[PDB]
Design a protein around this nucleic acid. Structure first.
Lengths: 98, 103, 105, 83, 533, 104, 94, 99, 91
DNA sequence: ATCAATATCCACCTGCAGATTCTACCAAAAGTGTATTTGGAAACTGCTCCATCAAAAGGCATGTTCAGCTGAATTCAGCTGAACATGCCTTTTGATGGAGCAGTTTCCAAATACACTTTTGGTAGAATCTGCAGGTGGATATTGATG
DNA sequence: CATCAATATCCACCTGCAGATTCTACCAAAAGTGTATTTGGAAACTGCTCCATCAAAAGGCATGTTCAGCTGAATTCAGCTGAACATGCCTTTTGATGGAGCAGTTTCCAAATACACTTTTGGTAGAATCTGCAGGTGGATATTGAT
């Protein structure tokens, strides 16, 4: 059975998702999550589709930047695998946490 | 004859100091503030004033509103101040406006 | 007869806030209760911040508020720290904080 | 309206993996996904409320794209293409 | 010559032992070595401390004043060639202070009065073309033949010079004393100057000074004032208290003329007399300090008797008053001043005068009313402090039941149901006539005069004091005022200008105790010489 | 009959910029040359980013500028990237960037 | 319907001037409109702050020029300043 | 005879506490003023400076440095270390987005 | 004029080194740094240098805008706040 | 060193939603011309306050030694990457009641625009008060080192 | 691991001073009230766009499982680079002091609103033609892993 070495498919995905620009988060689950957050904030709310798209791309871009920072911290720690402490460090340096 | 003209160049500048000191007497009658402390307090109150006024002006512009009222200011208080601080500031503003109206 | 601050039970001058709002080019019209509400919010902020500063001063065996006391007041309150996260305090210093790994044994 | 719940699990593990791939991350530890989810939730809690605070101010009952983009701008995350 | 060497070795040795301040003067100034090729261009007498020692050793100095002049020439050269910010200037200042401390006992040990280099303040000149302006100090001025002077707006130079003190040579020993230090006057002692050492060696004493304040002609007012002051001092019993002599030294009848504005407005209508006659009197206060008369207080007053037309009738006005803070004791000094003024306020109310007027106008900086060159350490009172001083003096007068009451001029005008500018007193040189003329002019560009008068009255109410000496019906049935004191013709005090001009021309300064004593002695000699014609 | 935009030789609407400045409540008074200067600056920036986007599209064998082309143009210019360091471009993605350590 | 103004024809003309044979998509057009609006708002706000700090109640070319210098980095700022100076010179030359 | 010598870190921690409990300025006034003057003259010659402006610039720069140094210490600790190296400050500035 | 003592003080060109080693050490200690590498200092110097043209240029751009020749504290205050680093006490 | 199993690059062609090209309206801009108002150019000037220099002194720059920090080499438990089977749930196209977003009229309470009297805050100068910065004396862990 | 001993420092107490606090008086700038004029958006009604909801089919990844490659983590040990410290001096700070420019005063002219006409034209409803690339097909070409 033909099998690729670990990291080859990951790097193929690296080019694949750094070349294309379509959304990677499913529309309906994220819309449901946005509805849940709105319901927790204020009862009886409605959402425009363009507002949903704007929120989705904003969160996607923020998470992409956070993942880039986390990866930079990971290699900074002589590692290839990111761990939650890397995200904590990135958020602390960004000033979002402390 | 003419005297104490001071060459007509008496530089003056406005400041919240004397008011803030009064607030100090409301919270700590036996505590004082240094010149650096009052300068920092004036800078802080000016910065808060500028931020809240800019937020209120932007919010009024968003709804095509040419008049600034307390509604968009309290909305900006909710936006900019954190939860407990925003809630207490909103309550204080509401009580002050209610008392002013009934005054 | 009575000042607007006195009528609203306020210490900061309502008239000065109204004048600054007029001159600040924030809107072409300015409401009557807008300066009152803004003055009340500012009074609450100064009251809480000077209360925390006095608490820090009395904890530091001090009776005069210095920039160090103001820095301690703002930084030990996470809400004030979030409010002033992009603000640096003149002559305020930083909180005493030593990292765990740097500690001995 | 139905009270939606447990929708944070809708951000699937492959979705977070794809987001990391777009972010240039080659390897993912097991505890990453959930953690990122929480961060994502915080981000939403950072924006939607503000937009809601906008929506409440305009006497409107629907969230518009202008509210979202302006809340993102006031959060220092200005977005283009949505007005 | 070894005597002066033995005397002057400690003084220069104390100068040398000051380190590292005195190092730059150890050797002749070397321009090329120091990189200052302009030293000879500005300094015309290059020499140093080593040259001073060589002259002190090689039989060059005949008498110590030459050595004093040499060391002070070094001080002046160092000060002129170097800015006061520079190191050398401050080193020179410290060494000058050391020498001033050291030389005085040594110079006195040689029989000399002192060893100080004393120079007068710069002498402000006067214009000759305009006959009214003066030559400003530290400003561009024109001069010709050293006799004619002109201002910039009327040889081009700037007036920054210092006049040294004169010297008198003793007739017996030939030593030179300062004229001010020993207080020697040629008129008083035509026989010549003899130093104190020579007088004590032969058990002689200086001839009695016939040109003294006590020997000045006596007057009722001066005698009364001096008696009151002496009684007060005797009551106090102060160890430093002395004898105070008060003499009325000028008294002349003059007239004040209505200015053209008020002359046109009221005099031409037959509502005012064209002029008001009065008697102006100038008196000075003298005290004996160290056996020498010293002037410490003087004032100028104008008295309008019962013959004067109203509203100036029976009114006294204090035009100018001045004092010098050298009275002993200091603590009673101010009180002594009061003991003068109240006494005057008593004397007039004995004659029949009912109203007194005081203008509390403190002198401006650099300006003197009577005594020229006030001491630098004598503070000029501020208007509020001067007003409080006048109020205290008036309260003390009231406590003696001499003064019934005193008021501000605004309250006095309000009580006097004043309705026109005609009811205010008209005094010579007073502020009110000038401000009334200015108000009339302002009306010319535009009860209006009365309204402006009331505005100015309220604006400057705290400055003018009106004192009621006789009040009630007793003020309505007084006998005519007759002055027992005869007229004293003396042009030297016809106004405060003549005395100030004489003091400026003859360098009669009051900036120090010795200088003030010398000025007082010169004033007494001038008065005694002017008395005889 | 000469428009104020054509009077300065600009393509952007000077009158619209002036009207927006008046409606923006930035000051009680606005100078005459301020809308002209602002229109010139905005049109220069529009030309710069549009030219870079067209070059990026040509590099991608594309003659229609898409959001990806705008992102490629904005992120490939240092000054332009600094200008929009806190701006997210819609549907733009990210630059292809892989560091050596992850590479085999 | 209420008119919603935009920089449509102006940006299209700029595109034709710089790239006659290159077009833009709708989403990219919206991005460009958002960009120009954001730059306008930033420069105008900076100029307003500049006028407020100097006690000036009038916004002239100098204030917005200084705002552009503050915001635009280096070569972008220099080119924008030169182009705007040329524009105002031609505007005042007629 | 064996002079007293603190171990590496004791004096370090002591001065850590001392400088975190104090607020006095750490940069000397004259060299920083000279640096600011020359940086300003790199943009506009013959400029003049207020004392308050220099003090404000110094306080701002020291605050930025103390914040950045906190970030660098956190980054160095993240790598199982206690000593900072230029890679730590580079990472801190990259995360902050300055570079 | 003389003098007696005068040092050239050739430090103007290399004034970036004018930031003393103990100054950077103290700054790091205030930042909680326990151990400092030898390559930090000059690097931080460059970082310091950068911050200058991040702020003072704007202040200079302020000073030129006000037709003034003297850099004021108010220019510095707006220069810092425009970078998101608002300073209190110098208003 | 060669080779088989896959992903990559790429030319080509077809159907179409999106990009591009005319026709007509038009009201919201956009432009021109007086009357009006005014922020600011311009000159002279008083007054801050900024550049410059010398002494006191408070640290800053260098050399030594080594305990400890950092970094290289080795090993492994296991975890996450790669592959695959199963299928579910998201995606796409279509339609629909209706809550709600938004355009138009009316018009009053709220806003603005001076005139004016009231008081209130900003600044100068005097003089008394005081919190605190250091200075001196123990003296309190404490940590390095001795044992 | 228990404790002689040098050392930095919290505190117990002090005492002098720059700075904070108190009080009086002056005075221009706000500030509140009044009267007239103006208008922003609330309510009242209603046209209408898209937001939410329901329905049906399907396949693309979503979810789960299995095997193992290599990677973080642990361990060990060695070159060595900064920490602590003694030694020398030297750069800094502050006080004092000329004058370069920051503001205060006064004139007035080029320049920016207010507003009533008059003309251009950027959105934009509508229909028709053009067109770049989404998507599927097929085969040439690196890529990779271990045969």
């Amino acid at each position: 059975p033909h099998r690729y070495r670990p990291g080859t498919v990951a790097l193929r995905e690296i080019r694949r998702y750094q070349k294309s620009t379509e959304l990677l988060i499913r529309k309906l689950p994220f819309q449901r999550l946005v509805r849940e957050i709105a319901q927790d904030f204020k009862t009886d709310l409605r959402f425009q589709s363009s507002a949903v798209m704007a929120l989705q791309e904003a969160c996607e871009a923020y998470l992409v930047g956070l993942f880039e920072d986390t990866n930079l911290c990971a290699i900074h720690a002589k590692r290839v695998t990111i761990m939650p402490k890397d995200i904590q460090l990135a958020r602390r340096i960004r000033g979002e946490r402390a | 004859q003419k005297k104490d003209g001071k060459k007509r160049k008496r530089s003056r500048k406005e400041s919240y100091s004397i008011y803030v000191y009064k607030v100090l007497k409301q919270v700590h009658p036996d505590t004082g503030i240094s010149s650096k402390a009052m300068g920092i307090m004036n800078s802080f109150v000016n910065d808060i004033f500028e931020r809240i006024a800019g937020e209120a002006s932007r919010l009024a512009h968003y709804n095509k509103r040419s008049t600034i009222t307390s509604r968009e200011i309290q909305t900006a208080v909710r936006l900019l101040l954190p939860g407990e601080l925003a809630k207490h500031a909103v309550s204080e503003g509401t009580k002050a406006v209610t008392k002013y109206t009934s005054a | 007869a009575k000042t607007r601050s006195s009528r609203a039970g306020l210490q900061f001058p309502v008239g000065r806030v109204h004048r600054l709002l007029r001159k600040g080019n924030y809107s072409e019209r300015v409401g009557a209760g807008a300066p009152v509400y803004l003055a009340a919010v500012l009074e609450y902020l100064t009251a809480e911040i000077l209360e925390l500063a006095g608490n820090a001063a009395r904890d530091n065996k001090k009776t005069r508020i210095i920039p160090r006391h103001l820095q301690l007041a703002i930084r030990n309150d996470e809400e004030l720290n979030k409010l002033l996260g992009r603000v640096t305090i003149a002559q305020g210093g930083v909180l005493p904080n030593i990292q765990a790994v740097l500690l001995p044994k | 309206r139905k009270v939606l719940r447990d929708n944070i699990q809708g951000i699937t593990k492959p979705a977070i993996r794809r987001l990391a791939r777009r972010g240039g991350v080659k390897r993912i530890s097991g505890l990453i996904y959930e953690e990122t989810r929480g961060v994502l939730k915080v981000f939403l809690e950072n924006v939607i409320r503000d937009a809601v605070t906008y929506t409440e101010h305009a006497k409107r009952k629907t969230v518009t794209a202008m509210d979202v983009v302006y809340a993102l701008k006031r959060q220092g995350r200005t977005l283009y293409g949505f007005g | 010559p070894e005597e002066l060497r033995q005397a002057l070795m400690p003084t220069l040795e104390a100068l040398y032992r000051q380190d590292p301040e005195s190092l730059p003067f150890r050797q002749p100034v070397d321009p090329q070595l120091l990189g200052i090729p302009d030293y000879f261009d500005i300094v015309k007498s290059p020499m140093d401390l080593s040259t001073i020692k060589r002259k002190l050793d090689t039989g060059q100095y005949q008498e110590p004043w030459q050595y004093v002049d040499d060391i002070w020439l070094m001080f002046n050269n160092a000060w002129l060639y170097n800015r006061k910010t520079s190191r050398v200037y401050k080193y020179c200042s410290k060494l000058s202070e050391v020498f001033e401390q050291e030389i005085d006992p040594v110079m006195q040990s040689l029989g000399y009065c002192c060893g100080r280099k004393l120079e007068f303040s710069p002498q402000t000149l006067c214009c000759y073309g305009k006959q009214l302006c003066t030559i400003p100090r530290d400003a561009t001025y024109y001069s010709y033949q050293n006799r004619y002077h002109f201002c910039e707006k009327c040889s081009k130079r700037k007036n920054d010079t210092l006049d040294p003190e004169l010297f008198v040579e003793c007739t017996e020993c030939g030593r030179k004393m300062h004229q001010i230090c020993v207080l020697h006057h040629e008129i008083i002692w035509p026989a010549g100057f003899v130093c104190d050492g020579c007088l004590k060696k032969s058990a002689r004493t200086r001839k009695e000074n016939k040109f003294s304040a006590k020997r000045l002609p006596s007057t009722r007012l001066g005698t009364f004032l001096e008696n009151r002051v002496n009684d007060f001092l005797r009551r106090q019993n102060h160890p430093e208290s002395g004898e105070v002599t008060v003499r009325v030294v000028h008294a002349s009848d003059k007239t004040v003329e209505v200015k053209p504005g008020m002359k046109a407005r009221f005099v031409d209508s037959g509502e005012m007399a064209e002029s008001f006659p009065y008697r102006t009197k100038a008196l000075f206060a003298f005290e004996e300090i160290d056996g020498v008369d010293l002037c410490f207080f003087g004032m100028h007053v104008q008295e309008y008797g019962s013959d004067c037309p109203p509203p100036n009738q029976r009114r006294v006005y204090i035009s100018y008053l001045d004092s010098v803070h050298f009275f002993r004791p200091k603590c009673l000094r101010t009180a002594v001043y009061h003991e003068i003024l109240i006494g005057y306020l008593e004397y007039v109310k004995k004659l029949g005068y009912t109203t007194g007027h005081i203008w509390a106008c403190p002198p401006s900086e650099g300006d003197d009313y009577i005594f020229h060159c006030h001491p630098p350490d004598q503070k000029i009172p501020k208007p509020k402090r001067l007003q409080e001083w006048y109020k205290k003096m008036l309260d003390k007068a009231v406590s003696e039941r001499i003064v019934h009451d005193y008021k501000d001029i605004f309250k006095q005008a309000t009580e006097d149901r004043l309705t026109s500018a005609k009811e205010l007193p008209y005094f010579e040189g007073d502020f009110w006539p000038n401000v009334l003329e200015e108000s009339i002019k302002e009306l010319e560009q535009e009860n209006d005069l009365s309204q402006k008068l009331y505005a100015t009255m309220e604006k400057h109410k705290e400055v003018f004091f009106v004192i009621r000496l006789i009040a009630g019906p007793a003020a309505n049935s007084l006998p005519p005022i007759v002055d027992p004191d005869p007229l004293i013709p003396c042009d030297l005090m016809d106004g405060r200008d003549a005395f100030l001009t004489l003091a400026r021309d003859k360098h009669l300064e009051f900036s120090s105790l010795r200088r003030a004593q010398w000025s007082t002695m010169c004033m007494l000699v001038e008065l005694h010489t002017q008395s005889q014609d």
